[PDB]
Amino acid sequence: SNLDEDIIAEENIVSRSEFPESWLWNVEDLKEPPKNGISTKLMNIFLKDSITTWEILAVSMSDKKGICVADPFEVTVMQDFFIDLRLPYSVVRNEQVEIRAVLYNYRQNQELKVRVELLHNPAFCSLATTKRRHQQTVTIPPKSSLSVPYVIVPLKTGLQEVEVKAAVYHHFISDGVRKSLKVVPEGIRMNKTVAVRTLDPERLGREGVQKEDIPPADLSDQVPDTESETRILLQGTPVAQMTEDAVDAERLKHLIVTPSGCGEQNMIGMTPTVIAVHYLDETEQWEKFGLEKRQGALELIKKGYTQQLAFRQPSSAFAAFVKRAPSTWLTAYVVKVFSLAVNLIAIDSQVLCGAVKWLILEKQKPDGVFQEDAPVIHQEMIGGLRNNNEKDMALTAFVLISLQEAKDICEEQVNSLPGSITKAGDFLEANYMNLQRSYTVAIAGYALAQMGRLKGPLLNKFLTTAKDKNRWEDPGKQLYNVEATSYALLALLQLKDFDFVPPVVRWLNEQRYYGGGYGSTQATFMVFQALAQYQKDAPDHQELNLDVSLQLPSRSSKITHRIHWESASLLRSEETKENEGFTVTAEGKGQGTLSVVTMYHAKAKDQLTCNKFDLKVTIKPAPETEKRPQDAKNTMILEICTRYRGDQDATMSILDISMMTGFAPDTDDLKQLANGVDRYISKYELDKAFSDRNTLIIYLDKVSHSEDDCLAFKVHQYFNVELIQPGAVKVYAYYNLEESCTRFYHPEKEDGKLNKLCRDELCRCAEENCFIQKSDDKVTLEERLDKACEPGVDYVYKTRLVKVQLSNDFDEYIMAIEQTIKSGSDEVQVGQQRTFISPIKCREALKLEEKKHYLMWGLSSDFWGEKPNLSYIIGKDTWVEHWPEEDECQDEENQKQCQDLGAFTESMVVFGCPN
Amino acid sequence: XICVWQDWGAHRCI
Amino acid sequence: SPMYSIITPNILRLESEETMVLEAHDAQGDVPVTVTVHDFPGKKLVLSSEKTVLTPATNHMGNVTFTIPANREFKKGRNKFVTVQATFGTQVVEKVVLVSLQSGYLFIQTDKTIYTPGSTVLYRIFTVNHKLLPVGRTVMVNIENPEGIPVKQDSLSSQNQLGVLPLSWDIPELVNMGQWKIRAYYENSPQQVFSTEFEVKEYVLPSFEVIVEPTEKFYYIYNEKGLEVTITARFLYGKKVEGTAFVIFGIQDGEQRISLPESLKRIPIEDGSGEVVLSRKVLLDGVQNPRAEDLVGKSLYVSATVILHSGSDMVQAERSGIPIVTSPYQIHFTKTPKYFKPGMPFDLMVFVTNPDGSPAYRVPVAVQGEDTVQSLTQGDGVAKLSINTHPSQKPLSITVRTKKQELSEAEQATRTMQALPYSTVGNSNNYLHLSVLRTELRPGETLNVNFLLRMDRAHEAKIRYYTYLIMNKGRLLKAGRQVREPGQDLVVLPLSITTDFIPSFRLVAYYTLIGASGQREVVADSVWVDVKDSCVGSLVVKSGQSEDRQPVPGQQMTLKIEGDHGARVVLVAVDKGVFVLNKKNKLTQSKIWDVVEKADIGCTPGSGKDYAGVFSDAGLTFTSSSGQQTAQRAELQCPQ
Ligand SMILES: [Ca+2]
Ligand SMILES: [N]
């Protein structure tokens, strides 16, 4: 070429492209020797390409000084001339949009003449081709900016790039921006939950397994050629336990009493205070009670223990009075109380085990029975033992329970303890079945459960003795049934028969028996001992190991998600995108939930665009002015009609108008519009000469919801360019840019749409790939042969033009194949016809006339459609050459071509291509 | 001015 | 007979250094002390065991330090307790103390405030103990979707990491929009969850920033000019915006937002700036013309939308919470003790703010009536007012007003509080008053702490010393003795202030004397003292070049980092356009100290209804062998 311009060439512009939103995610250690106790680190960084201000934040961590967040430090990156390429976050495939390249001139006293260009890209359709980029020359005053519109159509989904470059005449500066945006399909995201099932193999499982198969979804409304996903989520329930409430601490205040009296009455007083502390300790209820009161309660317990020692006889046994024969029951009850208090105060082992040894050596009969030879005189403090038939059984069980309670402390001191326990258990076990009273069944039931001997028929007798499966009851004082049910609860906990305990603990709590008072000793001690052991033995939570084997088909077998109670709330589950079957097999304790939601893109029934505004835009020739001049000023009328789709008028709204290339609004028309009810055009914009008049914003005070509001103004063509880009109009209310509507306009393009070729969801640009006119005089035979034998050349044909079809989109040439010179993909036979397609843009370079013959060759990359509807696109790499008839070859003007074409055919057919 | 009501001390109220 | 006493924080934290102050009053010779910590009430395991000796040389005052470990007995949300038991020779002094399960602080930094689907969230977790120093422990980290369900769980130790745990998470392309959460907690303290939020949204970065500010931080209800607002619009690289602004106002009443459609204005933005007024008439007409006084206590908000003259970019910004007032100021007594010592000076620490809560500088304040004491607020909005009190149980009602020269009386702020008399032991009329200058206090300075004694003169000479204790960050930082010689009603402690005292401290002081027949009397006071917030160390990032011009894209540049020797520094660079869209949840040093201050175990500005209340309200137990002690603390949180 020869053109020489005073401007940086496009080839020597490297576009800016590194625009991260954050960077410098760096770690630095201040190892340098400190000067003022301050260590300084010099750090070389390379600034990104963004023209912005960076905010750099540092946080430091020190062993001696802790954490310090610095004040932010700002670095402004700036430049006198540059492009701001404003791309949307995303755009829909095959939908036309307008983007703006905003050109900034921050030189203070210098105006810039600028050439800006949009680069060609096969992922988009625009006015740029591979022969010439879409270029524009503009003038930017100092301290100003200019918005350059580009109209593009995204042709393929995914991350795509737009690139714009610009240079300045007579000042050798430049800029380029290469910026990405997401191209998405036309289908809207849709979540359709197909099935939600619960998983519990040990609850709803039949043979120990939970099978829950779900078929895949049909997804008939899905757009074609789009990716879909299937999200099958797994959320387990960390399972907990239902524990009956403890007795509230306030109910035990009256149980803190001071002991007094002789050997029996002192223990009546000591009983409630010991068991109350026992219960408050186990239920962790001292906070509600008042913590510092525990110290005082311990002191009262020590006082009761100390006072009871005055009634310890030389034999180590106990009686009401020092000269009274010792009581078997009272000595065993002292063991019962003292043993539970060994952790609360200092209990002398010689006192406790001395009483144990005396019971065994003096009061156990050869057959194992414990015998009372001097009954207590407070007959109300022995509970259900009073007036009890089956006395040997009841008293033996009572003493044995005391021995068991003391066994851990006293085993080492009382050799006779293991054999005494065995002998007493033998007696109880041998006679348990003949028992008639529920009280004895309960107390001896507990004693036998402590020895692992409550089994089989004895276990069944114990359980079936209970009334309504929640209480052990005889006729008499209701206190005896509270005490008996407490013994049974302790036996149930000993057996770990946890399915049976809830109704029993409920019946006891419903009793609301809080102990204390006349005759309350055994019931008070036993109910709180039993209810404390209930809280101690209560399981904190149920178990979750749902070992669900959930490997979908064609996924082999990998590590599946274990909710494992700990991570049950966690939803993390990697999934396959392709819709497949769901085979669920659950095994394990606990319960969980399972849901299957399907992802995909689905086509909407109608437009998602222009939902809040209607917008209709027309462009038409202006009529003859009454001045009647030369009127070389090609003038059109642009009319814009808009309506708000709501119950009330829109408030303040914006008409953002871009001109067709080389057109500018009529100033007098703008002044007429700017002076008007409900409309404003800024003075900044009414007084501008061109190289700023490609854009125009009209401000509306309102937009009617009841009917179109319409305006019109003339636009004049001040500059012919080869390619007139469609203009555009965008309407929206100030408070929501999203709820807009954009229309395009152009005198020659349907609806202002760039020409493109679309079958189904694939489109290719038809503003490019034009046939190239070539003169006949230069082309030799060797050059035709050398070109037609290139591997890229798929087909070579001699044809006859049967039928021409001119339209404003694509011209069709239904062409008859008279000779298959070189075959390719399309196995066309001689005589068959094929349709050749050429865009309207390319019309000047193609000289095709019906009934005439042509030599044609082309590329497989220019095929369009499938086999039943397989047409050929005539493009830049398509050879199309008129074939003179035999009868025309005698003309001197045809000799060279006739010679070339005849020899070309003979060589192609007879000898073929070299190598 | 600022003082303390008592019979002793340099800052007692008068 | 010697009285032994122990003083601890009244909330003990596990896995953190705690100090117990031990004193043997009126004892002679060496006193051995064994301190142990048991679980309550079982007292089975020994959690800690320390020993010391109290000698005449150290005036029979010392301490032990120890660390209760993380156990199985701790962690259904019931309060846990330990029994602290000090044995002086053979005399046991026992105190049951509340335990806090939370073991330190976690701070979470994300690289940005907002993200698109398909991008990566970079984040760090800073693992510090209660002294804000780095620790190496195990942390659980969760990422929660807007529905509050964890999508991702991690378990990491920060051992050998200098308290910095770098992490990341890839946001899928198909994701739910909205507020996402990063939740972290120490493995041993699952009750304490630390959090930060980040937004997930579809956006492009704007090219400029819009700032909306009223000409005053309030709307005065009798200002006939209405509310004037300045709209500023600047490109991110600093240049001024030319364009058009749409401005509309509203009034907020509790949670109700009421737009004022007649206030909508379209104005030019020329040279980056524009002005708009909400007229008083439009405001009052917009709420159906009540009397203007009914709007006081509500607030106004302003939304501005700015469009470039090219129409190629748009940015919206809102300013909300503009109070409608009758006064430019408000007075707060939140830093003044609610108890006084009858017969002694009562010091008020008056906090004056503008209606947005920022401190008000150089505002005159005065106590209504009496001696007409009048003071000027410092840069921290604080002013000290001292009044004399008479020896009577009559509760003290105090009203403070501003005296701003330029304002009318109706425009001056006013506030009233009540203080109750400190109750003495046996109606002894024996008191202690601490006093401090309330100027802005920096590390490296010396603070004179005044100890003022009220005691009848027959008993006076017995008080030879005060015990003082300094609480900071919920631990005992320091304890000492302030001597006194007979006849001295006022003695001064020169307290050297260091970075250890940031962000504030409490000084508790007490003396003890023997009434005849052996009855022991304990008299205490306390003050709260602010320290100006800064980093304990320091960290600055600046340019290592000469700013002859602004850099160009791709240019190499030297960063200069100035900090403490051996510190690990972690960095990020963020396009300020990000902050135009979302500026919430960023880590700052002011937020760290606010977290530290919320966690204080002291709860009042000072004094108390009695000696026990003085200790407890400052976060301390006191227990003596002769029965004088604080009451049980009921809750982990401060009363309200
Ligand atoms: Ca502070
Ligand atoms: N006075």
Residue numbers in the entry:
A (entry chain B): 727 to 1641
B (entry chain C): 1 to 14
C (entry chain A): 1 to 75, 78 to 642
Sentences copied from the publication:
C3 cleavage releases the anaphylatoxin C3a and produces an opsonic fragment (C3b), which covalently attaches to the target cell surface. Concerted binding of the proteases factor B (FB) and factor D (FD) to C3b generates the main C3 convertase (i.e., C3bBb) to activate more C3. The compstatin family of C3 inhibitors, to which pegcetacoplan belongs, is particularly suited for broad complement inhibition as it largely impairs convertase-mediated C3 activation by all pathways and prevents most effector generation. Finally, backbone N-methylation (Cp10, Cp20)13,14 and the addition of D-Tyr to the N-terminus yielded analog Cp40, which featured picomolar affinity and an improved pharmacokinetic profile in absence of PEGylation.
Here, we present the crystal structure of Cp40 complexed with its target C3b at 2.0-Å resolution. Instead of the truncated CUB domain in C3c, the current structure had an intact CUB and associated thioester domain (TED), as characteristic for C3b. The peptide Cp40 was located at a shallow site formed by domains MG4 and MG5 of C3b. The structure of C3b-bound Cp40 is well defined with clear electron density and acceptable B-factor values. It shows a similar conformation to that of Cp01-C3c, with a cyclic structure being enabled by a disulfide bridge between Cys3 and Cys13. The crystal structure confirms that D-Tyr1 interacts with a hydrophobic pocket on the MG4 domain, thereby extending the compstatin binding site. Rather, the improved affinity can be attributed to a strong interaction of structural water fixed by Thr391 and Asn390, which is shielded by the 1-methyl group of (1Me)Trp5. The N-methyl of sarcosine (Sar9) is oriented toward bulk solvent with no significant contact to C3b. While the unexpected orientation of mIle14 could be attributed to crystal packing effects, this residue indeed appears to mediate target binding via intramolecular stabilization of Cp40 rather than C-terminal interactions with C3b. Instead, our models show that binding of Cp40 to the MG4/5 region sterically prevents an interaction via the C3:C3b dimerization interface.
